[PDB]
Amino acid sequence: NEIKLILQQYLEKFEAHYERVLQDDQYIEALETLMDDYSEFILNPIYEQQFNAWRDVEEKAQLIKSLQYITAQCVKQVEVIRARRLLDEEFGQCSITSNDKLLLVGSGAYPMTLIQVAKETGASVIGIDIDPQAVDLGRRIVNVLAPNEDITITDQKVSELKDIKDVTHIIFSSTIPLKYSILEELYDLTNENVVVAMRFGDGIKAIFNYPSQETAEDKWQCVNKHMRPQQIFDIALYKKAA
Amino acid sequence: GNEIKLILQQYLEKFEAHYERVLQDDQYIEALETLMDDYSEFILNPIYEQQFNAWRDVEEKAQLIKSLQYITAQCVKQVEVIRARRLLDGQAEEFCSITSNDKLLLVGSGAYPMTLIQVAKETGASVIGIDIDPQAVDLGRRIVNVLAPNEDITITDQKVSELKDIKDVTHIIFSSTIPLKYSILEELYDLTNENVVVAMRFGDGIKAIFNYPSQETAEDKWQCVNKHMRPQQIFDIALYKKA
Amino acid sequence: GNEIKLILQQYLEKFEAHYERVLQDDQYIEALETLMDDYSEFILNPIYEQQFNAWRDVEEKAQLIKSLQYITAQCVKQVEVIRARRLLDGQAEEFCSITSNDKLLLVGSGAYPMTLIQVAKETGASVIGIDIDPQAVDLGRRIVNVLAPNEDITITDQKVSELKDIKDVTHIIFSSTIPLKYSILEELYDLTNENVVVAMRFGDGIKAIFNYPSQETAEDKWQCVNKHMRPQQIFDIALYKKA
Amino acid sequence: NEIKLILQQYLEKFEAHYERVLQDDQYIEALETLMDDYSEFILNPIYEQQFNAWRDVEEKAQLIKSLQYITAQCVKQVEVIRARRLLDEEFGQCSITSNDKLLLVGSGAYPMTLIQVAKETGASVIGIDIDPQAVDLGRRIVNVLAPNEDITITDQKVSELKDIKDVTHIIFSSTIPLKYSILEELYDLTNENVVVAMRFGDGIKAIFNYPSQETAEDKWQCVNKHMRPQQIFDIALYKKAA
Amino acid sequence: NEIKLILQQYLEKFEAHYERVLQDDQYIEALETLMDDYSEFILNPIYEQQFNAWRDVEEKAQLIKSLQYITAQCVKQVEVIRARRLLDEEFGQCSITSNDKLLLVGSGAYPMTLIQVAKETGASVIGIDIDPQAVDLGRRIVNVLAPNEDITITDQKVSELKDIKDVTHIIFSSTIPLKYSILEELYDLTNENVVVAMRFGDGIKAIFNYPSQETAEDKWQCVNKHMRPQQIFDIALYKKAA
Amino acid sequence: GNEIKLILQQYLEKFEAHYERVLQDDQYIEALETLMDDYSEFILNPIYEQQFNAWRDVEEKAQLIKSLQYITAQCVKQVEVIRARRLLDGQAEEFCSITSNDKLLLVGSGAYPMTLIQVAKETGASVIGIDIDPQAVDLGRRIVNVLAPNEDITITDQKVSELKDIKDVTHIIFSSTIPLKYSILEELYDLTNENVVVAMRFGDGIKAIFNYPSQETAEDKWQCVNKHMRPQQIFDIALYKKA
Amino acid sequence: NEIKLILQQYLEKFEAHYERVLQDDQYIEALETLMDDYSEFILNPIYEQQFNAWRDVEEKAQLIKSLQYITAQCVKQVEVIRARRLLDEEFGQCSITSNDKLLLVGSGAYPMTLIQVAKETGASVIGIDIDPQAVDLGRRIVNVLAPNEDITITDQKVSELKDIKDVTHIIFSSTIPLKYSILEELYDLTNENVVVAMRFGDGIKAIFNYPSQETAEDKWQCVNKHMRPQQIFDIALYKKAA
Amino acid sequence: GNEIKLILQQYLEKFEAHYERVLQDDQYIEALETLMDDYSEFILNPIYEQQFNAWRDVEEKAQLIKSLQYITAQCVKQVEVIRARRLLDGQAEEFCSITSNDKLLLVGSGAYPMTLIQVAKETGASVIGIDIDPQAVDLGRRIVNVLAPNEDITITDQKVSELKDIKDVTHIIFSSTIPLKYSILEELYDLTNENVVVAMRFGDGIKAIFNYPSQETAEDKWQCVNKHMRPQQIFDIALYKKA
């Protein structure tokens, strides 16, 4: 009972903060505070166990779907504003080095992950994003924070990437709704030895993430699933079936 | 590939426009019904199915499927309402396995509940319809009073957990256009007697643009015991019993 | 004896008055329908049946039966018309033996042909309704268009000899309230294929006051192969095949 | 085809003559002439065979029922007017003598048959009729044409006849619609040795008569059926089953 | 007259064949032929109408009672021998499906009906019989012809059936003399919505069946009576009065 | 329940044994008569009646009733024969409505026809006794010659259809222990005059173990006009006249 | 890997049991047990999913073709031996009644399906089979189990059936290799309103059945496909294109 | 009709006999080769093709096609072996699109791999032959050493999944007489680079008696981009690229 009203309250605030933040930029501090609060809520064992206990399976879905939608849009808005203001253990043995090439799907307006991996690894990195504003801001952020690195950001779809066969590692942003549809597309486009990290969130985490899914055993094999109690998203590693 | 995509986009745009038009004027219903007839012919045409299956832009295809199944579910609801209003105004297969000692629940009964009425008259079974939309319940009840006043038909806006008699239900039918139908199936497990049979209406592949698809179930709970693929009908049927 | 006679006389007088009233004002229909409900309860009450069977004034009983079956046949026709008009205005078991490859003829389809519509929807068979009254054909056709426009239903005012397709008819149903139904059965012999089955609706004894009775047939032509006596329904059924 | 239009023409004339004869008595001569014409039509082998050949079984019935109705009423009207103006081989071995008692059902306003049998046989005769005018006229005719004979005419139903058990012979007028219903009633009312002559007409004769019927073999046994090509009605003899 | 001598001849043969079949099994073929002959006799419209015409009501009863007795015993003997050698439209809308439970009273040594309904419907079926030999043979036949089906055969009386309240449909063998006494007992034992099919035979059929009876309108209501000219037994359907 | 059942079983076994014994030796008659006295006291005891009515094993109760009414009917016949033989050897309420102008038929007159003799002497009526058993006729005739030689009593072994004078019979009495008495009543309808009155002896409930029960009649033929329930006598009486 | 060795083991046993059963009849019990085992294997979700997962598409084909061949021959042998020892919801609205006529292609030596439909429906039934021994045994079985029914068994090809145009329903045995070639032939031979039920098995079921095929949209339209998880064969319904 | 059937039966019987004879004596090879020449002329004769297409016994035709394509595939294999043995003993169009930078795989290389040798010498491409029959590999290798020792030709008995270099293959050719060639095509999809081109040899209609036919492919995988029907050659060619 309690969980439903918290989720409802969250959804209300999120939709308001979003509309207010799109109307005026100074609402960013409040939205960030809400997001920190939300993150703490999700990772708190009380609320996580209460969410799972709630067995109104139908009723939970509409809040989940609503929240995952509005939060994804809020995260994008935070990144855009942050950008304008400024202006591999997960992989284990399959980690990234200077001889590798990383594609990030959903690079974002403030592409910190992309810059971070490029600086530490030396690897060539490619980010794609469907939102042209995110591509524009992301590129400009790269020019300021990592101009010497080999980072390319584009609005190209995976099937338009001329160098897709040379990619060794792929990371998916969690807040991409059709991320498994893209993964399916990538099977034919990629070399045999590629490794994919799918960010996801299941259970209560699905209110701030898109969930995991079962994949066709004939294409992509899940080789690892990493559950991170202190992180807002978990990671699943996929390799092509041999 | 590109032709299927363009056709789907065109249908998507037309359905969205027709929805708005019919919401502000019920007299545009005949254009919606015609569009829906055209859509059905496209879906049931084996050439279009083959080419839809050939299209390789998985992401674009998923986005169009998701958008179309949503807008088409709402248009179907509106057609049912307008049809019910017109008959009342005067401007007008799942399972024999159901008998008169049985009790059928139909989830998503609709404003024009002809399926409900047909089961009652043909079988003599007790029939319950539920709908989440109260307008559909109200119109549905009035349709039942006009066409089948002496049959044992109850239409309510109760959730499955609220139903007093849920343990005595022998048969359940899900409307295809219910998004969360498999989540409801999961909840029904503990609510129902051991011998209940569920007919899940669905559409996969090209049929998923006018239907919600089938899903895997938990095999310790529900078992698919029968599947009817119907190449000339807009939805297929899967039967489930408890494991 | 005397009590049954008085009751029958009272019903006769009331039916004649109600007929006149409804002919000059369709808004008195609810009183006729109520009277008919009351009549049905009387007929299906086993105490009244026993006492009707006990009454020994054969001649008086025959006169009342003949008068009642006539006036009640006309009242039933009027009820069907008014019901059809009201649904259209917006002021609102025989044989499985019939399949979709079959073809049913119903003699006396009526202005509110629900039986016709039910056979079509449940079986998928081709269905023909005939009626001698053109108003019943017209209203019947319009009812069919409203409720079952996509089914293969034809309603006409043709006699059985005029029907182009009479040789392809697999099943025939007679309305109970047709006076000359057995004479029609006789004519159908040469018009129909060897395997046709006929369901004759009838009522004998007390039921003959709201129905035309069964009759002996020529045994070289038609043979009774089945008879269903239904103590809680207003008419019984006899099945005939060719000898 | 031809027969249907003759029957239609007959029905039309009959209904007119009836209405005209009820409005004014001087139309009697015309109605009598029509009835003589009708009788000749029925007994003529052409029309009799044409009637039987007509296989519109449904269509024939409505004309029959109509004609038999209107003609029965015309015969009564002729008898009434005739009365006012004035004012046993069939049985064979079971014939009527002076020691017998005859009941005629449907004695009529001009009860010639009743007077005729009474004068020839010496038998006591009783006539009944449902029409009080026919009883009144019939009695008065008897007083004029056979006052010395033992003839009683009454409006009593068979079940009200105190002397019904002493009746030896019963004759039914053909134009009584429910004559077989009366016959069924008579089984319990009559002695064991009674004989009944049922006047009837089948085929074309049914347009001027009510037809014969099958009887319950357990009560009344048909012992003879007399077909008379030159008579408007035929005769069936019934005795109680032994 | 003729009917009485046929019935007498039948009774004589039946009593002989029975005694001979109990003495030696090889007489079964002759008894079967007699039973086929008898069945054809009963369903033949000549003999059926002659039987009804015979109005020696007292005399008919002793032959009926005798025949119905001897024939019932012959049918049992046929079933026993058949067994050893080997070793729902009636209901209409109230038909049997896989979720129903059927009790047959008088299951017999060769329980074909029980196996037949179980295989077609999927319903759980229970047969009872008073004759322990019939229970023993019936069970063994089931094990051979339908081992996977849910069929239980027992010598329990209806009042000893622990699952009687879950029964949805009941069928009575016609050749049970006190079948209506059992029906009366079942009213208290059964659920509200049960449907009963009483096999019976009236008229000539009563020489191979026990007859129908009027029931207490307060308990069991006859809802249908099915007369089957080409079948040795008819069916009456009963439901509890509402 | 169980006690009544055991008592009935014990009486059944004892009656069967006593029948056999008396058939092979008429000197065991006194034991049969004593058993029958005991049986009568059991039947007429209102405590046993109440508990018999309480017993709920309808089938078992019906079987015992049927077996007892049969064996007791034969024992009663044998007692009558032995009583008649002993008087001859020298080793020894229904209707005033009967008058000397009347004529009584008693169906089942018996070997010791005291009822017959009593009606004749008290009323002066003409009396006919019939019995299906010729030994009963013979002994009955000889008893009548000894005790009432000057009365108008005829005993024959004719069926009711064979009686010359059946139309002149004013009164009829049926013995209770005749199995097919109501079927005979049905046949008598057409054989008898309009004013005949029939006294049917019967026993229902507990009394049905020593009697054949009453039955419904066809109401168009025979009408019950009077019923005498006699708590201290072994049979009750119902009077019938023609409807 | 595991599936291939099971299939190999099955094939070995099947070929042995077949050769042994053709040499001596007493091996029938073992072959039946093997067939029950095989049926359970095919319908078990583990083995069905393992079969589909095996992506040695070439290698699977030789085992399939081999198994479907040997099993078809074993089924025939079982039916022959069974025969010698002894000696419509699928259609839905298009079901079989007494006025219909059914042709079964591949009637078999023990034609239970043919007898079953004939007894329940009243329909006239025709079975054909290419194997003369199956025709001979099938006819003889019919004479014993259903002599009164209208069942004709012949070795005629579809094109030699004089009454083929009056057939309303056709059922194909699954184990007929060229069943779709026969279906193509039937288009010209049959009336317009005929309905065909093609028994088939796809996936793992193809090891005990011949598979489904795509048909010429211009002739036969698939109107229904019935997948039956608990049955060794599935059903496809075909009607002529309008 | 009957003539085509008889001819086919005669060829079937002759091929089966010749196979046996050549297996037990390689000196009967000239009779087999002559029969095969005759068969080719029959297949390529447009009159025989028309009449084969006219024959309406679909089932009989299918059985003969299936039997002939099997026995003829084995005879062709034997001819290749005997030809290879005789040359060694001393008793003796698909695609320019192939260049020296390319790499061709031929599935079903055969014991006398002249096609392989011709591609290598004319194009300068690297060539791989595979065969499932090890005798064909051995003889094929020895033929290549005799006639083309300096070309880059490798013949192996590896399946397509075993080939180290399968990703570098630019061109693939299937022998027509491989039964499961389209199933192999399906497996090659994931094994090969994006730009591979496949030449599928086939024969349909009359040509299917000496060849395996073409098939529909999954349109999301392989697309027919070109088809060459050759009325004077024993097999046709279809080219496939990835969708």
Ligand SMILES: Nc1nc(Cl)nc2c1ncn2[C@@H]1O[C@H](CSCCN[C@@H](Cc2c[nH]cn2)C(=O)O)[C@@H](O)[C@H]1O
């Ligand atoms: N969670 C939920 N619970 C309940 Cl009780 N009802 C729900 C629900 N989600 C939605 N509904 C209700 O479903 C109604 C559907 S009416 C259209 C029927 N159309 C056929 C054929 C068809 C298939 N494709 C298109 N039409 C069908 O959907 O099977 C509609 O009135 C809507 O208010």
Ligand SMILES: Nc1nc(Cl)nc2c1ncn2[C@@H]1O[C@H](CSCCN[C@@H](Cc2c[nH]cn2)C(=O)O)[C@@H](O)[C@H]1O
């Ligand atoms: N000769 C003839 N030929 C044809 Cl083609 N039609 C004829 C006809 N004679 C009359 N009719 C037509 O029959 C119609 C009957 S509508 C009432 C149905 N009611 C049920 C239940 C019922 C039983 N009792 C009361 N209602 C029934 O009658 O079975 C009526 O519209 C009338 O115009």
Ligand SMILES: Nc1nc(Cl)nc2c1ncn2[C@@H]1O[C@H](CSCCN[C@@H](Cc2c[nH]cn2)C(=O)O)[C@@H](O)[C@H]1O
């Ligand atoms: N169908 C039939 N027709 C005729 Cl003419 N007679 C028939 C008959 N069936 C049987 N009988 C004869 O009836 C005689 C009965 S002597 C016992 C009288 N006892 C009293 C009091 C009584 C009641 N309960 C026990 N005793 C009574 O039964 O009323 C017996 O001799 C038997 O041969």
Ligand SMILES: [Ca+2]
């Ligand atoms: Ca049920």
Ligand SMILES: [Ca+2]
């Ligand atoms: Ca049919």
Ligand SMILES: [Ca+2]
């Ligand atoms: Ca007196």
Ligand SMILES: [Ca+2]
């Ligand atoms: Ca190149």
